Structure formats: C-alpha cells, structure tokens
Amino acid sequence: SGFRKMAFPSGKVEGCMVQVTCGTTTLNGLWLDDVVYCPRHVICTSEDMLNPNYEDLLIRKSNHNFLVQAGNVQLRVIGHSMQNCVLKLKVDTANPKTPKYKFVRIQPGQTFSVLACYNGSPSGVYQCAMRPNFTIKGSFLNGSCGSVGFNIDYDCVSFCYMHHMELPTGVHAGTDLEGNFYGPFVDRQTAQAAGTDTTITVNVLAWLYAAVINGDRWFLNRFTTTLNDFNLVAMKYNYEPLTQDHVDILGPLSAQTGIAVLDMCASLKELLQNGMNGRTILGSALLEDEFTPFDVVRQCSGVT
Amino acid sequence: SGFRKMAFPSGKVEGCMVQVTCGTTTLNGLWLDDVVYCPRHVICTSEDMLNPNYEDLLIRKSNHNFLVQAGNVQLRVIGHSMQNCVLKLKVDTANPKTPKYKFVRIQPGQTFSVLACYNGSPSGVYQCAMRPNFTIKGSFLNGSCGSVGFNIDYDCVSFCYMHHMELPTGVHAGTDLEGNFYGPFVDRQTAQAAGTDTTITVNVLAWLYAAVINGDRWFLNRFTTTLNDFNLVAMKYNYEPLTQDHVDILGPLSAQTGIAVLDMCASLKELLQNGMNGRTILGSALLEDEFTPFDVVRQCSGVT
Numbered sequence: 001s002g003f004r005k006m007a008f009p010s011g012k013v014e015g016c017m018v019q020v021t022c023g024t025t026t027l028n029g030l031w032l033d034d035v036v037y038c039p040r041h042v043i044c045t046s047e048d049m050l051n052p053n054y055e056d057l058l059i060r061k062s063n064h065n066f067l068v069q070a071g072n073v074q075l076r077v078i079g080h081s082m083q084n085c086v087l088k089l090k091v092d093t094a095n096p097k098t099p100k101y102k103f104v105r106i107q108p109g110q111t112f113s114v115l116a117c118y119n120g121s122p123s124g125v126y127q128c129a130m131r132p133n134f135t136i137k138g139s140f141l142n143g144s145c146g147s148v149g150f151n152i153d154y155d156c157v158s159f160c161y162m163h164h165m166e167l168p169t170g171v172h173a174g175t176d177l178e179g180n181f182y183g184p185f186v187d188r189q190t191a192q193a194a195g196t197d198t199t200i201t202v203n204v205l206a207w208l209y210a211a212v213i214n215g216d217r218w219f220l221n222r223f224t225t226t227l228n229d230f231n232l233v234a235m236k237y238n239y240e241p242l243t244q245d246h247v248d249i250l251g252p253l254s255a256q257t258g259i260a261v262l263d264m265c266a267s268l269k270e271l272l273q274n275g276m277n278g279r280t281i282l283g284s285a286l287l288e289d290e291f292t293p294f295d296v297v298r299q300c301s302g303v304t
Numbered sequence: 305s306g307f308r309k310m311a312f313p314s315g316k317v318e319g320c321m322v323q324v325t326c327g328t329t330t331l332n333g334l335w336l337d338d339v340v341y342c343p344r345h346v347i348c349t350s351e352d353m354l355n356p357n358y359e360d361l362l363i364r365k366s367n368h369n370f371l372v373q374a375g376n377v378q379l380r381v382i383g384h385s386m387q388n389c390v391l392k393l394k395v396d397t398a399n400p401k402t403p404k405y406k407f408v409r410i411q412p413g414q415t416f417s418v419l420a421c422y423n424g425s426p427s428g429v430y431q432c433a434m435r436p437n438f439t440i441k442g443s444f445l446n447g448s449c450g451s452v453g454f455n456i457d458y459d460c461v462s463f464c465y466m467h468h469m470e471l472p473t474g475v476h477a478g479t480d481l482e483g484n485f486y487g488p489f490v491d492r493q494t495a496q497a498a499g500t501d502t503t504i505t506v507n508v509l510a511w512l513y514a515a516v517i518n519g520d521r522w523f524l525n526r527f528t529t530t531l532n533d534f535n536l537v538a539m540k541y542n543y544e545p546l547t548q549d550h551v552d553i554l555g556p557l558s559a560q561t562g563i564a565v566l567d568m569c570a571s572l573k574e575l576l577q578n579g580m581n582g583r584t585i586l587g588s589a590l591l592e593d594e595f596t597p598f599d600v601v602r603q604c605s606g607v608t
C-alpha cells in the first residue's frame with residue numbers, strides 16, 4: 001500500500017551520460033553505441049541564441065571542436081551531423097554500458113522519468129507527464145540541456161525526451177531523440193506561446209482508481225454519468241474530453257475495483273463541481289494527472 | 305526553474321540489489337563488499353510472523369539455506385549472523401559494483417530516496433521523509449522488504465533505511481542498516497501504534513523559500529512574527545516547534561532571497577490560519593514538508 005510519484009530506476013541511463021563542450025558552451029550528451037546525442041545549441045554563443053543560423057554555425061565547427069567527456073575519459077570524435085535540433089557525434093568507441101534501447105516519440109498525456117544532469121553528471125531523477133500542450137513542468141537549471149526523459153520495460157530503455165529549453169513562463173520544452181521538438185517550439189531565445197493546457201482526464205481517473213485501491217474512498221458517490229454529460233463538465237473545467245479509447249485503457253482498473261468507468265467519472269464530476277472540501281486524496285489536495293492507467297497498474301502490482 | 309520531488313540517481317544502489325530466499329520466503333538483500341544485508345524475517349513462515357522467536361528460528365538455519373542471487377548469478381554463503389533486526393550473510397565474493405558507502409541513522413524530518421525492489425529487481429525510485437513519528441509514507445507491496453533508503457554525496461552512498469513492514473494503518477516501518485528500528489516498532493505481525501505525527505516545520509519553510517525562488521510569491525505578506533508567537537500557531541496546527549537551530553539551517557535560503565526567517569514564519573502562520581484560498585504553491589494545494597533546507601539549496605543550485 002501507499003502511492004508515490006515513482007520514477008524508473010535511472011541506472012541504465014546514468015551510464016550513458018557524457019559532457020559535451022563546443023567553444024565556451026558545455027551541456028549533456030547521451031552516449032549510445034558509438035554515437036553521442038546532444039542539443040544542437042551546444043555550438044551557439046550568447047549572441048547566437050537570439051536568432052541562430054545553425055547550418056552556418058555548424059560549418060565553422062570540426063570533429064576536434066566537440067569535446068566529449070564520459071566521467072573522466074575523453075572520447076575521440078570521428079564524425080558530426082545535425083538531425084533536426086540534435087547533433088550526433090560519431091565516436092571511435094561504443095559505450096560499454098549501452099543498455100537495450102529504443103527511440104520513441106511519446107504522445108501528450110504520457111509519462112516518463114527525467115534524469116537531470118549537469119556537466120555530464122546525474123543530479124536527480126523525477127517523474128513527469130508530457131502536458132497536452134507539449135511542454136513539461138520539470139526542474140532544470142542552466143546546463144541541464146541534454147538531460148533525457150525515458151521509460152523502461154524489462155531491460156529496454158525507451159528514450160523519449162531531450163531537454164532543450166526553458167520558456168519565459170518557466171515551463172520546459174525539448175525534442176524526441178531524432179531532434180524533433182514536441183509542440184511548436186523552436187531552439188531560439190525568443191518569446192514562444194505554449195498552447196492552452198488541459199488536465200489529462202484519463203490520468204486523473206487512473207489516479208482515482210489508485211486512491212480506491214489504497215483506501216482513500218471518501219470521494220465515491222451514489223451517482224453515475226454518461227460520456228456526453230461528463231464531457232460537458234470536462235469542457236467547463238478545461239479537462240481533456242474522455243473517449244471510448246480512454247475508457248478501454250481504464251478497463252483493468254475498473255475490473256480490479258469493480259467500479260464502472262462511468263461511475264468513477266461521476267465521482268470526478270462531483271469533485272470538479274464541489275472541490276475537495278479541505279480533504280486529501282493520496283496525500284494531495286488537488287486532482288493529480290501525472291499517473292497514467294499503465295503507471296497505476298505497474299505500481300499497484302509490483303512490475304520490476 | 306521548476307521544483308520537483310527529486311530522488312537521487314539510483315544507479316549505485318541498483319548494482320547492490322540481490323534476492324534472498326530462505327525456505328518459502330523471498331525478499332531483497334543489499335550486497336556491499338562480501339556481505340549481504342536483509343530483514344531477518346526472511347527466515348519466518350506465515351505462522352511465525354505473529355510472535356517469532358528469531359533466535360530459535362535462525363538456529364534451525366544453515367549457510368546453505370540462504371539462497372542469494374544477484375541478477376542471474378548465485379552467491380556462495382560462507383557465514384550468517386543476526387544483528388538486531390537484520391541478517392548479515394557473509395558471501396565468498398565481494399560485490400564488484402560496491403560504491404563508496406556509509407551506514408547512517410537519519411534523524412526524523414530528514415529526507416532520503418527509496419529504491420523499491422521486488423525479487424532483487426529495482427522497480428522504481430521515489431523521495432520521501434522520515435516522519436517525526438519514525439514512520440515513512442512509502443509505496444511498498446508484499447516482497448518489497450529489504451528495499452533501501454539512501455542519500456548520495458558526490459560518490460558516497462549513505463544507506464539510512466531498510467524496509468521491513470507495513471503497519472495496519474498502511475504506513476511503513478523499517479530499520480537503519482545495523483537493524484535498529486526507527487521508532488518503537490517490532491518485526492512482529494501485531495497491531496502497533498505509531499506516535500502522533502507532526503508536520504516538519506523547517507521543511508515547509510524551506511519549501512516556501514523554494515517557491516519564492518521559482519516565482520510563486522502570492523503568500524508573502526506585510527507581517528512578521530517571533531519564535532514564541534509562531535510556536536503557539538505551530539502547536540495549534542500540530543507543526544513541529546521551530547528552534548534557533550532550524551532558523552540557522554534556513555540561513556542560506558534567507559540570505560539568497562533576502563526574506564528574514566521570521567518574516568517567512570509570518571507567511572506560514574497566515575497560511576496555517578487562512579488556508580490557501582483555492583490557490584497553489586509549486587503545484588501543490590497543501591503545505592509540503594518533504595523538502596529539507598539542504599534539498600532546496602541542492603536542487604536550486606545544481607549539485608550533482
């Protein structure tokens with residue numbers, strides 16, 4: 001029993017972190033096989049970041065300009081190339097600690113763990129969600145660029161995020177490992193609007209099931225609703241509309257607790273319309289949306 | 305910017321996790337040098353747990369009865385001994401992945417990361433606090449016994465906790481790595497009262513400073529208070545009394561933000577007396593006490 005914002009064990013990712021330096025800028029790199037991946041803005045100076053011409057900046061660079069250091073050893077760079085917003089530095093040595101891995105592009109509302117790094121050294125690990133507007137609410141300081149987000153299934157690390165920047169609003173933006181930004185963001189020091197965010201409804205419902213499993217049941221009521229009625233409330237409170245696909249993914253949690261998905265929607269509707277009345281659910285005084293149905297089943301069963 | 309419930313990178317601890325089996329029971333072990341540490345209740349059967357005579361149960365056991373498996377390799381047990389509530393199984397092979405380490409006994413109100421494990425395999429990592437009543441509010445299922453709590457300074461892992469049990473209330477109890485329980489708990493399947501818990505005042509103040517650093521400032525007010533006046537409010541709301549030692553540890557955060565500790569106490573007093581009025585602080589709708597002043601400075605500066 002108990003329910004925590006649990007991150008994946010970061011060990012397999014810690015063994016991939018390196019430091020990349022180009023000129024005066026130092027950030028983090030991900031060493032997988034004989035390739036080091038990092039944000040392409042490692043080639044920029046302060047003056048460049050306002051409106052960088054990355055193709056032109058990279059032309060002034062050579063393999064010997066990218067200094068890559070894994071712990072205390074120096075990697076020999078034999079090639080460099082830009083793919084979207086990431087740089088791929090081919091090195092002469094495959095990382096011996098390379099775990100089984102995949103590069104995935106997650107969907108908004110999905111979760112992942114972030115291993116925050118500075119100077120190629122891991123500082124901490126936390127779990128978070130890719131917001132519906134493609135931003136993440138992380139904890140990153142200058143030099144955290146290149147830190148990555150990932151999920152782990154058995155022995156396979158699926159890398160899904162690489163940190164690139166902090167928006168003037170204090171929220172974070174980044175790319176998939178092919179260097180494609182999530183959302184409309186560009187790697188430029190310019191004001192950039194993030195979309196209107198919404199609360200991930202399927203995740204709040206999953207967390208409500210996790211609460212029932214762990215004993216917090218005060219929010220259960222004598223009511224039910226329909227997808228259409230629930231969605232009218234979801235609209236009013238800027239929640240994502242619930243679809244049959246979301247209902248389907250909640251199937252196992254509904255089966256385990258015997259609480260029909262639409263009956264749980266009616267508890268959520270009442271919580272949206274009345275608030276929590278000074279009470280808590282799983283130690284939170286608000287509706288939590290950073291746990292997917294998969295996360296809840298994993299944590300509630302003991303998946304290693 | 306941003307503020308997260310960050311756990312230490314778990315890599316150094318993952319390389320120490322093993323599975324220990326004795327008879328029908330399987331739990332987690334911590335392999336450091338040539339010793340494997342685990343909860344002594346690994347020797348118990350279901351009938352034993354109600355009132356176990358551990359000295360007598362261990363006498364029926366031999367080195368060959370403790371099966372210790374690190375991943376897929378089998379460790380040869382050359383000695384066994386009970387120290388308080390832990391068993392120390394001497395093995396013929398030192399763990400090659402043994403990091404620099406210490407065994408520490410943390411104080412109530414201090415924080416640490418937990419690497420939840422099952423069958424010797426890591427499942428997740430989360431940060432938590434040792435409650436003032438010596439319980440922890442973790443996330444543990446059957447088989448998580450033997451999982452450990454730790455802190456990391458540079459390259460040194462200080463192990464501070466080993467999980468032993470879940471109280472009927474759903475809260476967790478465990479020992480230091482010398483097998484001494486935190487609190488009055490005994491490793492028996494019996495109803496056990498945990499003390500009246502209190503909120504860790506120094507930690508809430510530290511988190512209020514973290515909020516100001518990251519932009520959440522709505523709670524700052526035109527007031528101040530004294531240690532005596534603040535403690536009268538702390539008493540009413542079951543908060544730990546604030547001492548000059550707590551004020552002293554908040555010194556750096558007070559210096560960084562220029563907000564005197566007693567002025568921050570007056571914001572906390574107003575929040576205790578008025579609630580949050582439907583607002584949030586660092587994404588929380590309640591007063592967070594699982595971040596120490598050290599944690600806040602570490603996260604806010606970038607300590608790796």
Ligand SMILES: CCC[C@@H](C(=O)Nc1cnccc1C)c1cccc(Cl)c1
Pocket residue numbers: 041046049140141142143144145164165166167186187188189190305
């Ligand atoms: C002058 C470089 C700043 C860097 C940047 O946001 N880093 C950063 C990241 N996370 C937290 C804090 C910080 C300061 C950046 C700005 C604009 C666009 C891009 Cl691609 C990068």
Ligand SMILES: CCC[C@@H](C(=O)Nc1cnccc1C)c1cccc(Cl)c1
Pocket residue numbers: 001345350353444445446447448449468469470471490491492493494
């Ligand atoms: C019948 C063994 C149960 C075990 C126990 O609480 N495990 C456990 C731990 N964390 C979460 C869930 C669980 C089921 C235990 C009970 C009483 C005392 C002791 Cl020392 C151990």
